[PDB]
Amino acid sequence: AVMVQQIEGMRDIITEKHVWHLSDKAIKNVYMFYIMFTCWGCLYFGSAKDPFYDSEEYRGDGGDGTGYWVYETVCISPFLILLGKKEKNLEMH
Amino acid sequence: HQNVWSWTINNEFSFEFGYFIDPLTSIMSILITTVGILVLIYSDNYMSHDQGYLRFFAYMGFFNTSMLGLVTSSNLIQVYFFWELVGMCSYLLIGFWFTRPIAANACQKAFVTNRVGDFGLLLGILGLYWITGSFEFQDLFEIFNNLILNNRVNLLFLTLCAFLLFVGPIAKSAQFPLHVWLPDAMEGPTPISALIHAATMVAAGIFLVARLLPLFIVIPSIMYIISLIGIITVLLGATLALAQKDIKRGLAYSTMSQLGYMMLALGMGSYRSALFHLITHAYSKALLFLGSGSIIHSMEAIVGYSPDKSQNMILMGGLTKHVPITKTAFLIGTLSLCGIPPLACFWSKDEILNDSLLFSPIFAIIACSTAGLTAFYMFRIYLLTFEGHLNTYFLNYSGKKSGSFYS
Amino acid sequence: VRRCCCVISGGVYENLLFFPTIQLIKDRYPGVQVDILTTERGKQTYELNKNVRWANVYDPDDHWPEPAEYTDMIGLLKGRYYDMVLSTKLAGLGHAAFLFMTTARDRVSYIYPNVNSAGAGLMLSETFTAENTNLSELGYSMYTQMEDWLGRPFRSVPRTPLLPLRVSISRKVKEVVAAKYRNAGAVTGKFIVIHGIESDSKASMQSKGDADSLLSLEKWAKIIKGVRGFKPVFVIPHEKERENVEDFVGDDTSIVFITTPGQLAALINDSAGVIATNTAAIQLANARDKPCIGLFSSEEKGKLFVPYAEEKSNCVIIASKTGKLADIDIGTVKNAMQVFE
Amino acid sequence: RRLAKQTTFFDKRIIDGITNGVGITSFFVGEVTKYI
Amino acid sequence: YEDSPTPVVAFLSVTSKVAASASATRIFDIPFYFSSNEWHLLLEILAILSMIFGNLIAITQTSMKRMLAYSSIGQIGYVIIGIIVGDSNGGYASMITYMLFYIAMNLGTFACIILFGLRTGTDNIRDYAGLYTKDPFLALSLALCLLSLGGLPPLAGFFGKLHLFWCGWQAGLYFLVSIGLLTSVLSIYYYLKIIKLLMTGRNQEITPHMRNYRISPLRSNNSIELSMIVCVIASTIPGISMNPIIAIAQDTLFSF
Amino acid sequence: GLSQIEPDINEDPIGQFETNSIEMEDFKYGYYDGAHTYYEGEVQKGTFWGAIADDIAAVDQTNGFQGLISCMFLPAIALGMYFDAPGEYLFIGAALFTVVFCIIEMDKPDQPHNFEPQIYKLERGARDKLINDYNTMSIWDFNDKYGDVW
Amino acid sequence: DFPWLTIIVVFPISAGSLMLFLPHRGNKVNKWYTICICILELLLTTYAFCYNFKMDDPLIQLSEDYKWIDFFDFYWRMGIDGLSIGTILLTGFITTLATLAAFPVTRDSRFFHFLMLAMYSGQIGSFSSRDLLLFFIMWELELIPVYLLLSMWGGKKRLYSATKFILYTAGSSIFLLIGVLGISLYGSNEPTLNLELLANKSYPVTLEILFYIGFLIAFAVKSPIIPLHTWLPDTHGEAHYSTCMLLAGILLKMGAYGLVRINMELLPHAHSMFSPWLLVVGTIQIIYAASTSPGQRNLKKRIAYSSVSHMGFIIIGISSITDPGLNGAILQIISHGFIGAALFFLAGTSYDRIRLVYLDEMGGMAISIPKIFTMFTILSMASLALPGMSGFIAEFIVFFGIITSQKYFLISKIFIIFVMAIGMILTPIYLLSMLRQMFYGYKLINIKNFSFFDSGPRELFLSISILLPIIGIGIYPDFVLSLASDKVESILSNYFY
Amino acid sequence: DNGFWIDGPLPIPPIYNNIVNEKTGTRTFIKKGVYVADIGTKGRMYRVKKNAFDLLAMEDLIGPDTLNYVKKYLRLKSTFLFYDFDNLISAAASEDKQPLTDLANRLFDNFEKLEDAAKTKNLAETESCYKDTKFLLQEVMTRMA
């Protein structure tokens, strides 16, 4: 592993060169354990007290889990107050 | 010693991540570790009244990790690796106080400027791989003794490759094109002013150019380019620190002018005096930044918390009467930059100008003129901080003070 | 019909005046889910309508819209399956094709006196040429063509007004505006709203056809010095007018920040007096019987934007003797003393 | 920043414009040939 | 197909077009193999215009049986690609199995349209908003029949159009197959325009002709539901199980 | 947000690139960024094990058995290597782990954040799917407001 | 031996098919049932991989064929290359984390998670098939379920973006169908469809160029090549996070898979004809998409055009006729699968917390949600091609494939390296502009009355579990290159002679 | 051949009349595309030393379930050695030419046998060939140094 390098410029070099590679099997092994960690984490952290998607801040206002519950909320609750306003005018407010 | 291991072996990569122990490795390693330990001892109390504490020390330790990996690097792959990681740590340290938006503009400008240098380091190491096929610090030194003597390689490609390879050190050592990231780094902490510059990270470019000087003396025109960029930024770094209201920005431009001195020494071909000036500046202006932050943390009790109040060098006035050991430390630092032979640092600048005047008459007397300007603004900083009345509790000025003294 | 769009344009004031047209539409056919495809600050009027269903935001006068947005809105109107368009955007082909790509039974628009309105008759069942090309400049009514065709005598009466501009507020906007002037020193029955302040703000709710519609501040300082204080609350279009009004007319003078026309009508409904210039607030004051005065820059413009001053018998109209909004500031104080008590 | 605004103008207006205009043209020819 | 009743719209459209494609092979191969150049050119003109215009009118109609009639026009324009190809370079067997698929996935669509009208009474396409919430079975059957008619997953109609475009590409009819593919995408648009309605629903996009659906006031376990689910399975699995159908269709070589 | 009334339009769209933050004239240093907060003497102990178990106990829905198997699952793979090399046994064990976890996650509480936002009207505790198998309470049609008060 | 890839692919569809009615009218039962099925499928993938996938042999492993239709000669050809198993593991992993992130959806979660499993089967069917026509079957079987997800779940103008996506992908998959019709019919004597039999043909240039265009316009919309990329800022930017993290993680990278699978080993000479043009188009793609990103006021569209920008490195590595080029392309496939998946996940969660879409509003939020901030910051660093992360070594091996090309000369290579290296300047501009807009800063009104909830432990496991293989590849890149370098040698054997 | 992007066959560089091939075929460790640089004859002489030391210090790589990386590392470094010996014998001094090319032939047949040993996943033949290839790599390094 010892190589003495002769370069005229600065100094001599004592390069080691430990050529190595994670065994072919060990790459499958680290994939195996990481799929195990993914499995464990999916199960356990799905079984966790998820503090944002439980409260009346999210599930109360809208909160179906989509990305449009805000927009259908602010597009339907004004129609809800227009409906309530018409039903108010139906009894002469 | 070049204790290299293997990193990827699939095809023409055969990549290594080994650790190259030259005397430059020793200089850079002690230059990182001593300054980092002292800045951490400082930062135990600098951050002691900060809600952001542990993520600062995570950024500090990961920066020290990255910079020690940068200086122990056997190939341009790993230099590139830890180079960009140092740039990321610069982004994180400057945008540490993330809630203030001027630090947000500062850290964005900083990381973008470091990526403009990263750009050049990339197409500079790829150009060296096209000219050599090396990706190692070992074989470049024994190929560039006879690579320019060949007919396939172009001299134009080698000089533009070396200039793009120098674009990186422009962004790290805050040289004249890519210098606008350095004085905005003040909005983060004062330890990152002592560590991002006057230390490790602006020594990354100095380390890179001095490590690649066996392939910078060979390409003929790049040495003049490095001399030119240094001699342009020493007049910029001097004239900028003449009229700064901020203590930290003024010491930043002082750091930038001394880094221009280092690049002017690297443009001399001076393998020895450049590194020695790097050592004495990186131990001098680091002391100057810690003294400045002690001034700042003393002024926090007066003015409350504000950088236009507690970092404004104008209304610091005089602190010799109040904080004496800070005065002595800051004075020994500013005499270490002003060039006092017996009890300060002068032999570095002596070797700079001695190697300068026998080189080219254009670059020499303007370097001595900037040295006089450097002594001028550093003594201006010392007088505005420590010598005179306080400028803030002064009974001519503060009306609340006249209301408070006369009960 | 059962589903009917409205591709109205202009902003607060033009879309406000369209409320008798919408009430005419729901009076014409019994159950209609009316929609609105208006510009921004047009949706904000449609709390005050109790008739309609969606009331989107489109800015129809954009004339080079985002093609994603343009294609999305064409497909949205196709997916709502209308029967009648009722544009009053005042454009021809290019926009007549926009109304034509909607699967609509009754394509109705307004049409330029100029050329950019040719080839539109091919794609519209009603043409409705208009005047001035500045359609808000025609005045209050603005839709007599569309009012007279929607509900022609075919089975019964047109019924073209139903006590025009019956806007209506809800309890939520009433409570939040009640808190907004209760932060000021006003009592819920006894105050006077203004909504006339010289500013550079799009919450001024003026018109498209009126230029010098908003009264100054030192002229307003003369008006507010000449008048006795019945707690005049001041309705700024933007927060940079607050310190400016407190510099001109005083610190004791209460300032209520309102940019929403629904909030503005809620502030009308608790007031007892209205000193509005030619903004939405005159029409909101005539809604729900509040005594207005209705400042203007011209007697003729005041007749175009109020043809019904003789009808409500409270909105005693005042205009400038010349143009340029410089009136007497004296007799308007006199009939402000007359009608407000 | 000006180059970014010019480039998103070229994107959203006149290469997303062509793709959206294919469907706009199909809607238009469908509405015309329905009523011809 | 507006005022004429939906069962005879189904029966007459499907039976008329299968017997007309029967005659369109029969009186066009045996007494017209000499003028086959102008014959193929006339069928190519009518086929390309039919594929374009049926699928390009059927986008923009608020009715349900009218745009189904135009989709039937477009699918018969797909059948004419199998008419133009001979017995040899991709036979009429593709045309046969696509007619089998066409019957199977079109009678299910019309079974669902009949059930929307034996329970509501209307045929307006905008009344479909909210069928998934009221009746997931009928919504699933109609959505799956429409996706069979369009052909996105491996259903029957996708493999029928694939066998058609295969035989047309093997015969060299490039400008038939490419136009058939573009109009297949154009069919996919108005099919998923329908499937927007019978899946979604937002409590006022639903119609009062939809909200009172009343599946329970019904006669019995009907045979409409039985034939409908037979057509749904015959729109799903014979695309998967096509090899016996092609194996029983390729043996029709006596058409001459 | 909620916006029961229609919101005020921003008359000043501050900039297409710069942030929505206040400027340096109104930025009180130290008390905003936290750079000069943390005056200690008010913080508490629970050092690194009285605050890990505090956090694990803060966010957890697991009983004694499930959770013990979860804590012993990953060491059962970390001992799958370095102690043996069983092969398929790890995968079959983790498969049965996931199957028994999913069977355990057919929990007795049903937790109305697991339900539709159309369920949220009032008195939803009297709704009891937690005990009633094959509920047949036709309310999920979601097209008209049902009084399920029985 | 065993029907491996068949029971891989058919298991999410056939196991999600047990949600027929299943009377449990919350999201709990079908939620946990589908995460159970996705974990079982991931363990099936790993068990087929660690124990019956030889990482040395550059040939068709887990080979399997059935009979489907005798007339098409259409089989059920299944088999994995070295270029395929990275994408299969990326598929299983990212889609399992997608249905993990898809827990709090509760609108119609039965049909939602069923179409999640339908995508989770159809994608592995696309990557695993050794057939052209079955690749097309699965190329359009991945279309209607993600349509039904896109349109009924997530996004403001999600209807427009959903119809634009389904029409755009259908109107390009018809060109894919033209390509497979051309190769199968007019490929050679004995018309076949097995890719084991088909990658060894003559294909003269006037026919191979037409085949290559018929597949390049097909794959150019799916790996978004800048003449055809209009579908993506709508499709990704107007979807919610759990569907978009598989739309960007694995659905964006097929096609780029097909440019390696179909357009590189089936059609080598016309790929050598047009890869000079694809190289220039990828270099314009990186700069173009990195410059359209600061023009986006929207948050999620910046990440969409960021994905378009990082696909340029894949197009360049495919067009770089080299082992480092193609191997960096496969590495950028897996790396940016993780990167785009995690960024669109965190953008969806940031919209769920802050409820603000654009970036003129939504100022300093990092004091409000520091966990989302630190994960989004570190994943922005992963997007920056910044080291210790897989995007760094991906783009650097793409650069190394440029600089070691036998196809190109120095006149081209200097321009290509220069234009590509401007892209790693433009990428910090929009990424740090996003960071300084939505996180850095301070709003005076936001002090205590809101007090937003931070990242919960589920979403934090999502972000960490995507972050860990990015780091593990960014420090040891042979987690990708070693499983494919043999196959890339077998590819480039056809190019270098 | 329009400057940028020479196109079509994508050739590998040839052999300049040397007997450095196998003669029953060219060679079995030829990596297809690698960038050996035109540095110069002393540069090729040094890179022979460098890659010969690489295959020398391939010690810690050889082991069970690692033979494929041994084969890839061998093909890579031996392709570098192959082009560098081709340039060295192509620029030889006409008396150093024949013994150094015989040395290269008896080195490359040793590389062929080691590549076949590591290709068939047989560790005993791998080590039994690696012994005298370590001898010959030390021999070629002390020749080039």
In this structure, what token pair is assigned to residue B151?
A: 């007919």
Contacts of G352 in chain A (CB under 8 A): 52-53, 58, 67
> How far away is chain D from the Cα of C79, in angstroms, using its nearest Cα?
13
Cβ-contact C71, G160 below 8 angstroms = yes
Strands G78-80 and G74-75: unpaired
Report the alpha-carbon distance of residue E183 to residue E176 in Å, rounded: 11
Single out the residue of E42, E76, E71 nearest to residue E57, CA to CA. Answer: E71
Report the alpha-carbon distance of residue G486 to residue H54 in Å, rounded: 21
Q: What is the Cα gyration radius of chain D? A: 15
Read off the DSSP letter of residue C192.
Answer: B
Report the alpha-carbon distance of residue C63 to residue G407 in Å, rounded: 49
Helix (H, G, I), strand (E, B) or coil at C33: strand
Single out the residue of F95, F94, F104, F92 nearest to residue F66, CA to CA. Answer: F104
In this structure, what token pair is assigned to residue G292?
A: 């359209």
Q: What is the Cα gyration radius of chain B? A: 22
Report the alpha-carbon distance of residue G361 to residue F7 in Å, rounded: 14
Nearest residue in chain F measured CA to CA from D5: F16
Report the alpha-carbon distance of residue G347 to residue G241 in Å, rounded: 7
Contacts of F30 in chain B (CB under 8 A): 304-305
Dihedral sign, CA of G240, G243, G245, G249?
Answer: negative
Single out the residue of B58, B90, B61 nearest to residue B201, CA to CA. Answer: B90
Amino acid at site B74: S
Cβ-contact C81, E126 below 8 angstroms = yes
Report the alpha-carbon distance of residue G430 to residue B114 in Å, rounded: 15
**Contact flag G170-E246 (C-beta cutoff 8 Å):** no
> How far away is chain F from the Cα of D10, in angstroms, using its nearest Cα?
18
Partner E contacted by F145 (CB < 8 A)? no
**Contact flag A44-F90 (C-beta cutoff 8 Å):** no
Contacts of F36 in chain B (CB under 8 A): 49-50, 300, 305
Q: Break chain G into its structural domains and give their ranges.
A: 1-497
> How far away is chain E from the Cα of C152, in angstroms, using its nearest Cα?
26
Cβ-contact G263, G327 below 8 angstroms = no
Specify the residue for token string 């092979």: E25
Task: Tell me the C-alpha to C-alpha distance, in Å, between residue G11 and each of C177, G30, G50, G98, G122.
Answer: 59, 16, 19, 17, 10
> How far away is chain C from the Cα of G157, in angstroms, using its nearest Cα?
7
Q: Is E9 exposed, middle or buried (0-12, 13-18, 19+ CB in 10 A)?
A: buried
Cβ-contact E148, E105 below 8 angstroms = yes
Strands B19-20 and C3-4: unpaired
Report the alpha-carbon distance of residue E156 to residue E237 in Å, rounded: 7
**Residues with Cβ within 8 Å of residue H41, at least 6 apart in sequence:** H87, H88, H91
Rounded (10°) CA dihedral H41, H46, H52, H54: -130
Single out the residue of F133, G125, C60, B5 nearest to residue E153, CA to CA. Answer: G125
Size of chain H in residues: 145
Task: Tell me the C-alpha to C-alpha distance, in Å, between residue C263 and each of A87, B48, C50, C169, C330.
Answer: 20, 50, 15, 8, 30
Compare CB distances from B50 to F21, F23, F38 and report the shortest one's residue.
F38
Resolution in angstroms, to 1 decimal, for this deposition? 3.9
Containing H29, the helix (H) or strand (E) segment is: none
Residue B11 — φ and ψ, nearest 5°? -150, -155
Cβ-contact E76, E25 below 8 angstroms = no
Compare CB distances from G479 to A27, A48, A71 and report the shortest one's residue.
A27
Task: Tell me the C-alpha to C-alpha distance, in Å, between residue E71 and each of E3, E61, E145, H20.
Answer: 18, 12, 13, 71
Single out the residue of G240, E136, G20, G43 nearest to residue F102, CA to CA. Answer: G43
**Contact flag D7-G168 (C-beta cutoff 8 Å):** no
Helix (H, G, I), strand (E, B) or coil at F37: coil
Contacts of D11 in chain G (CB under 8 A): 230, 233, 288, 292, 295
Which residues are paired to C106 by β-bridges? C84
**Residues with Cβ within 8 Å of residue G336, at least 6 apart in sequence:** G253, G307, G310, G311, G314, G391, G394
- What one-character-per-residue DSSP string does G169-226 give? HHHHHHHHHHHHHHHHHHSSSS---BHHHHTT----HHHHHHHHHHHHHHHTTTTT-T
Cβ-contact G12, G37 below 8 angstroms = yes
What's the helix, strand, coil split of chain H in %, to 5?
60, 0, 40
Dihedral sign, CA of B126, B131, B137, B138?
Answer: positive
Specify the residue for token string 């829905």: F61
Residue G256 — φ and ψ, nearest 5°? -60, -35
Partner F contacted by C40 (CB < 8 A)? yes
Dihedral sign, CA of B282, B283, B284, B288?
Answer: positive
Read off the DSSP letter of residue G297.
Answer: -
**Contact flag F106-G32 (C-beta cutoff 8 Å):** yes
In this structure, what token pair is assigned to residue G72?
A: 């098409």
Which residues are paired to G78 by β-bridges? G64, G129
Specify the residue for token string 């393998």: B271
Which residues are paired to G67 by β-bridges? G75
Strands G67-69 and G74-75: antiparallel
In this structure, what token pair is assigned to residue C283?
A: 């029409």
User: In the 3-class helix/strand/coil scheme, how is chain G assigned residue by residue?
Assistant: CCCHHHHHHHHHHHHHCCCCCCCCCCCHHHHHHHHHHHHHHHHHHHHHHHHHCCCCCCCCEEEECCEEECCCCEECCEEECCCCHHHHHHHHHHHHHHHHHCCCCCCCHHHHHHHHHHHHHHHHHHHHECEHHHHHHHHHHCCHHHHHHHHHCCCCCHHHHHHHHHHHHHHHHHHHHHHHHHHHHHCCCCCCCEHHHHCCCCCCHHHHHHHHHHHHHHHCCCCCCCCCCCCHHHHCCCCCHHHHHHHCCCCCCCCHHHHHHHHHHCCHHHHHHHHHHHHHHHHHHHHHHHHHCCCCCECHHHHHHHHHHHHHHHHHHHHCCCHHHHHHHHHHHHHHHHHHHHHHHHHHHHHHHHCCCECCCCCCCCCCCHHHHHHHHHHHHHHCCCCCCHHHHHHHHHHHHHHCCCCCCHHHHHHHHHHHHHHHHHHHHHHHHHHHHHCCCCCCCCCCCCCCCCCCHHHHHHHHHHHHHHHHHHHCHHHCHHHCHHHHHHHHCCCCC
Containing G74, the helix (H) or strand (E) segment is: strand G74-75
Cβ-contact E74, E58 below 8 angstroms = yes
> How far away is chain G from the Cα of D35, in angstroms, using its nearest Cα?
25
Compare CB distances from H60 to A3, A6, A19 and report the shortest one's residue.
A19
Containing B20, the helix (H) or strand (E) segment is: strand B19-20
Report the alpha-carbon distance of residue C154 to residue C197 in Å, rounded: 47
| b/e map B222-232, b = 16+ CB within 10 Å | bbebbbebbbb
Report the alpha-carbon distance of residue E221 to residue G287 in Å, rounded: 64
Size of chain D in residues: 36
Single out the residue of B282, B169, B206 nearest to residue B24, CA to CA. Answer: B206
Single out the residue of B111, B107, B130, B108 nearest to residue B119, CA to CA. Answer: B111
Cβ-contact H89, H18 below 8 angstroms = yes
Dihedral sign, CA of G196, G198, G202, G204?
Answer: negative
Cβ-contact G301, G237 below 8 angstroms = yes
Single out the residue of G266, G287, G255, G332 nearest to residue G422, CA to CA. Answer: G287
